[PDB]
Design a protein around this nucleic acid. Structure first.
Ligand SMILES: [K+]
Ligand SMILES: [K+]
Ligand SMILES: [K+]
Ligand SMILES: [K+]
Ligand SMILES: [K+]
Ligand SMILES: [K+]
Ligand SMILES: [K+]
Ligand SMILES: [K+]
Ligand SMILES: [K+]
Ligand SMILES: [K+]
Ligand SMILES: [K+]
Ligand SMILES: [K+]
Ligand SMILES: [K+]
Ligand SMILES: [K+]
Ligand SMILES: [K+]
Ligand SMILES: [Mg+2]
Ligand SMILES: [Mg+2]
Ligand SMILES: [Mg+2]
Ligand SMILES: [Mg+2]
Ligand SMILES: [Mg+2]
Ligand SMILES: [Mg+2]
Ligand SMILES: [Mg+2]
Ligand SMILES: [Mg+2]
Ligand SMILES: [Mg+2]
Ligand SMILES: [Mg+2]
Ligand SMILES: [Mg+2]
Ligand SMILES: [Mg+2]
Ligand SMILES: [Mg+2]
Ligand SMILES: [Mg+2]
Ligand SMILES: [Mg+2]
Ligand SMILES: [Mg+2]
Ligand SMILES: [Mg+2]
Ligand SMILES: [Mg+2]
Ligand SMILES: [Mg+2]
Ligand SMILES: [Mg+2]
Ligand SMILES: [Mg+2]
Ligand SMILES: [Mg+2]
Ligand SMILES: [Mg+2]
Ligand SMILES: [Mg+2]
Ligand SMILES: [Mg+2]
Ligand SMILES: [Mg+2]
Ligand SMILES: [Mg+2]
Ligand SMILES: [Mg+2]
Ligand SMILES: [Mg+2]
Ligand SMILES: [Mg+2]
Ligand SMILES: [Mg+2]
Ligand SMILES: [Mg+2]
Ligand SMILES: [Mg+2]
Ligand SMILES: [Mg+2]
Ligand SMILES: [Mg+2]
Ligand SMILES: [Mg+2]
Ligand SMILES: [Mg+2]
Ligand SMILES: [Mg+2]
Ligand SMILES: [Mg+2]
Ligand SMILES: [Mg+2]
Ligand SMILES: [Mg+2]
Ligand SMILES: [Mg+2]
Lengths: 62, 386, 131
RNA sequence: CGCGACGGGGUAUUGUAAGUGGCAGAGUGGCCGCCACGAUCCACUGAGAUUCAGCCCUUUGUCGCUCCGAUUCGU
RNA sequence: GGCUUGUGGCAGCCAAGCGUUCAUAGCGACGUUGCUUUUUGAUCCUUCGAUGUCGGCUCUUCCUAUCAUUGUGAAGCAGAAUUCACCAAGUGUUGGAUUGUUCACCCACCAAUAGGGAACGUGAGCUGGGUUUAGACCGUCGUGAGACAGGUUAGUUUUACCCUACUGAUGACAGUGUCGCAAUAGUAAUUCAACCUAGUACGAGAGGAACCGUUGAUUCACACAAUUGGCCAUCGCGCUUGGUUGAAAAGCCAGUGGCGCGAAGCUACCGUGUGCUGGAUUAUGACUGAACGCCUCUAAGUCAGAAUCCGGGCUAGAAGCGA
RNA sequence: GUCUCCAAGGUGAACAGCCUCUGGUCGAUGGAACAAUGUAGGCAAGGGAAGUCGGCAAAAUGGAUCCGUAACUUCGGGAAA
């Protein structure tokens, strides 16, 4: 079975051979599925506030 | 006086002139050296560039940082449906090089190949090879055909087969006029080569009969066209300062006072792209045979049931349904461009050449965006069947 | 074993990076990169794991106005791992060493790239998290 | 005989349309809980919009056109 | 630019002496023979109905008197490093502070940071810091107007559409089309590091290699866009300021109103892939072998032999040609 | 290049800029393509003057309210430090 990671921002599944990995100053590791999630993360947008993210849907019981 | 500082010249003088190629189909400039002790075999094949994707495999390179690790590498998909042999041609070795002795054609030629002989097929009467095909219908005519074949066996030193692609089987190409080329036959004696060629008349030769998995091949084709282009982009000369009067995308000095002429080694603006190129040492990672599990994107580690074509189709190409080759790296030309595959002229002995490939994952997400679903079913299940 | 593969170069000469050790220096000013043969007009540039010659523009007076070697441990320019993932850190950082690669300090603040740790065992010994 | 024009599906981008309803909403103004005002919020709604113009497949379905011509060329 | 080469630069001959011993490993005093036109002078032959006058930037090509790289000979060559000399110009010869500079000097990297030519290459290629008009200041000089291979600051850099060259583009090349041959021309790859050899050979010790092999990297070249990154008037979607259509809804105007994301296409050592093999030889070391009963790589005849050459491969394909 | 009179609404400190009403006007030869080079306007990963004679050019700053404001000074300033 393939090992797939999850996007820290959107929760999307990341398949092998791609992904953007950001190391925060506090040694936290963030995997982004694409530059859309990367930009919104660095713009300080909260996933809970974006309707399409998995975090929003889990908190709203979608 | 001498130039103040030294740097290498911009561009290569070995690819001159930088003109539009006088052909669209890649021409084989040199075939592999013939070894009579080996069985008769074809040396080249035609294909069509479908698109690119990336794969993941576990490297086995002792002494390397990647040993027993995974690496992601780009690959090109070349759709290679079987070719049809329609003729044979023999050459005699003369003091003025090889001279074409005779050309023997098959009795039946498809409509797709006949289109190659016309500029407007529909408006013509379609008389090509009609009178030629009749002499196969008489005993005296059959004897003449056999006599021509015996003439090749006696005098010919090089034998090449006339083969054309089944372009109709790839509807994405939107083309019905097939591509024809001469493919040299290596191995065996001259008589065996003629018998080998004549036996395939009107028959299909699969790509697997020419190439195989894990071998190095050469790709020949015409690069993507880009039209009139300036020196900075065409040759890679550095830009001039911002405050340059009359523009900065130029070569400042195009020559000394003497010789009182512009030399051919100076960068000049002109045609860029659509050049004939021959690229060496392209490893075959996978050969997909229709009707077999090798045609799908399954691997020993990834058991997801999916095809090679990414969801939504290969952009600007379509859906790959015929035999195809998965080639490491990038291929010359645009999507849909016919490319010529040739056996390597060198003896492949390096470890990279002999490395045994084992794919772990083949990406099939959409290439028309930031694709995140490998299959349409996965996407539908994600959105609750949408 | 094997040698390290090429990485995107994000730190040309005149780049000022943070000092990630406890030697007392607060930043490192890159003046050259070891192993660079160069090209006309091309600024020498360094990546994680490269040894560079630097000066301390801000720190203890004992370390200023001096040329010393240093090793890059973090960079902001994304670079490609062999597995196809592009990585980058939140800032650019380096540590002061001697010509033999031995750390002048004794501790490292923050994570360091795995590429640098493999080439410099002394730096990896004092590291906290190797990513 | 396929092509062409619609439409559909695939794919992708954005980020949840308009309308309706709400015992959501800081409060406020009247009447005797009712009524009026209210940014915003929630449900219908990963919705709506756009998607070849150089993306992919294609009648479930609709429609059109399939060729008036012109210029030359001979061992 | 030309003649000349005193001067500048480069090279040879003789051998007093230096070199612990020892003229000649490496040096060459006293003398003496040359070369060079990348120095500066000498001259005034060409140009005053005008050849744009510093340097840098950019770009190509050429030279060798070779800095590094390939192959070798010599040593006061143990090893390591270094020095002398040979074939050799294929490849490379960098990032910066100060100065208008040429020149110079320092910091740093590097296998190395060699030297030069091309109208002191290159201004209808740029730039205009300097020099070298007119404004102005200082110092010295002059009674003064003014002067200063003294300093200072501000000071318009024009024209190509002609011919040729060069770059690409059609056409021509005796019906038309397909598939090919091919003279000839161009041409390209490059250098380094790590591991292993090995703490081995060598050496009293200190110190301290190399081929093969493996894995990477530098410079360069040719492609390519799966992924990451970049570009937006997809004016694609959303948000938003001012105005405007009586409101709502939906739009429009502010030459792209602005902002976030943004597919596609294009694109970056900011991304990825690829970059080649025979023959003949140079230096040099040898074989057999006389001349010269011996000896001798040479005289006849042979061998090995390189970043060399030629071919092959790659690019083009002739008023060339075939099926 | 050439003197002067009349001067609406919105935003805003404002006959600033931007949009609108009265009045005026679409007058600048048109059509088709979207190569190089150019002119004008932009943007850009990481680095941040390493470019260059020289930060030339561009970018950054910018309104208002509150807080706070050094050296020096001719005591006025400096200061929107
Ligand atoms: K010069
Ligand atoms: K390129
Ligand atoms: K430049
Ligand atoms: K260097
Ligand atoms: K709604
Ligand atoms: K919703
Ligand atoms: K002389
Ligand atoms: K004159
Ligand atoms: K000129
Ligand atoms: K001025
Ligand atoms: K003919
Ligand atoms: K050749
Ligand atoms: K893109
Ligand atoms: K243009
Ligand atoms: K500067
Ligand atoms: Mg050839
Ligand atoms: Mg084009
Ligand atoms: Mg100018
Ligand atoms: Mg794509
Ligand atoms: Mg420069
Ligand atoms: Mg549609
Ligand atoms: Mg189309
Ligand atoms: Mg002397
Ligand atoms: Mg004259
Ligand atoms: Mg003149
Ligand atoms: Mg002139
Ligand atoms: Mg010489
Ligand atoms: Mg010694
Ligand atoms: Mg040279
Ligand atoms: Mg300066
Ligand atoms: Mg001269
Ligand atoms: Mg000159
Ligand atoms: Mg000129
Ligand atoms: Mg000029
Ligand atoms: Mg000049
Ligand atoms: Mg000046
Ligand atoms: Mg003056
Ligand atoms: Mg006086
Ligand atoms: Mg001046
Ligand atoms: Mg040649
Ligand atoms: Mg010993
Ligand atoms: Mg509204
Ligand atoms: Mg209007
Ligand atoms: Mg504007
Ligand atoms: Mg590249
Ligand atoms: Mg002998
Ligand atoms: Mg000899
Ligand atoms: Mg020999
Ligand atoms: Mg107001
Ligand atoms: Mg106003
Ligand atoms: Mg930037
Ligand atoms: Mg940035
Ligand atoms: Mg900064
Ligand atoms: Mg500077
Ligand atoms: Mg400079
Ligand atoms: Mg300015
Ligand atoms: Mg002040």
């Amino acid at each position: 079975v393939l090992k797939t990671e999850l996007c820290r921002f959107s929760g999307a599944k990341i398949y092998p051979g791609r992904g953007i990995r950001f190391i925060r100053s506090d040694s936290q590791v963030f995997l982004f599925v694409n530059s859309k999630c990367k930009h919104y993360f660095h713009n300080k947008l909260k996933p809970s506030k974006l309707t399409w993210t998995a975090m929003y849907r889990k908190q709203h019981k979608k | 006086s001498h130039r103040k500082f030294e740097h290498p010249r911009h561009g290569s003088l070995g690819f001159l002139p930088r003109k539009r190629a006088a052909r669209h189909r890649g021409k084989v400039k040199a075939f592999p050296k013939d070894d009579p002790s080996k069985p008769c075999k074809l040396t080249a094949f035609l294909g069509y560039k479908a698109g690119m994707t990336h794969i993941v495999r576990e490297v086995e390179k002792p002494g390397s940082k990647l040993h027993k690790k995974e690496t992601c590498e780009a690959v090109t998909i070349v759709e290679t449906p079987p070719m049809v042999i329609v003729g044979v041609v023999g050459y005699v070795k003369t003091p003025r090089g090889l001279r074409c002795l005779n050309t023997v054609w098959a009795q039946h030629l498809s409509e797709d190949i006949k289109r190659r002989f016309y500029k407007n097929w529909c408006k013509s009467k379609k008389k090509a090879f009609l009178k030629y095909s009749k002499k196969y219908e008489t005993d005296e005519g059959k004897k003449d055909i056999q006599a021509q074949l015996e003439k090749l066996k006696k005098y010919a030193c090089v034998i090449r087969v006339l083969a054309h692609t089944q372009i109709r089987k790839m509807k994405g190409l939107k083309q019905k006029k097939a591509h024809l080329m001469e493919i040299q036959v290596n191995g065996g004696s001259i008589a065996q080569k003629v018998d080998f060629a004549y036996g395939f008349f009107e028959k299909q030769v699969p790509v697997d009969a020419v190439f195989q998995k894990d071998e190095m091949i050469d790709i020949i084709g015409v690069t993507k066209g880009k039209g009139y282009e300036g020196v900075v982009t065409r040759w890679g000369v550095t830009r001039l300062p911002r405050k340059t009067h009359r523009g900065l995308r130029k070569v400042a000095c195009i020559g000394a006072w003497h010789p009182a002429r512009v030399s051919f080694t100076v960068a000049r603006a002109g045609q860029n792209g659509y050049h004939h190129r021959t690229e060496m040492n392209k490893k075959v990672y996978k050969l997909g045979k229709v009707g077999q599990e090798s045609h799908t994107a399954l691997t020993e580690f990834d058991r997801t049931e999916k095809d090679i074509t990414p969801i939504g189709g290969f952009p600007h190409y379509g859906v790959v349904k015929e035999d195809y080759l998965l080639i490491k790296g990038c291929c010359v030309g645009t999507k849909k461009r016919v490319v010529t595959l040739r056996q390597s002229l060198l003896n492949q002995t390096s470890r990279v050449a002999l490395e045994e490939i084992k794919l772990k994952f083949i990406d099939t997400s959409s290439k028309f965006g930031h694709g995140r679903f490998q299959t349409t079913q996965e996407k539908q299940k994600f959105y609750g069947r949408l | 074993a094997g040698n390290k593969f090429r990485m995107s170069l994000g730190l040309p000469v005149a780049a000022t990076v943070n000092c990630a050790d406890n030697t007392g220096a607060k930043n490192l000013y890159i003046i050259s990169v070891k192993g660079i043969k160069g090209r006309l007009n091309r600024l020498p540039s360094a990546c994680v794991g490269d040894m560079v010659m630097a000066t301390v523009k801000k720190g203890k007076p004992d370390l200023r106005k001096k040329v010393m070697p240093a090793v890059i441990v973090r960079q902001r320019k994304p670079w490609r791992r062999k597995d196809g993932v592009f990585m980058y850190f939140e800032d650019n950082a380096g540590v002061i060493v001697n010509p033999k690669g031995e750390m002048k300090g004794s501790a490292i603040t923050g994570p360091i790239g795995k590429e640098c740790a493999d080439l410099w065992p002394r730096i990896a010994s004092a590291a906290n998290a190797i990513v």
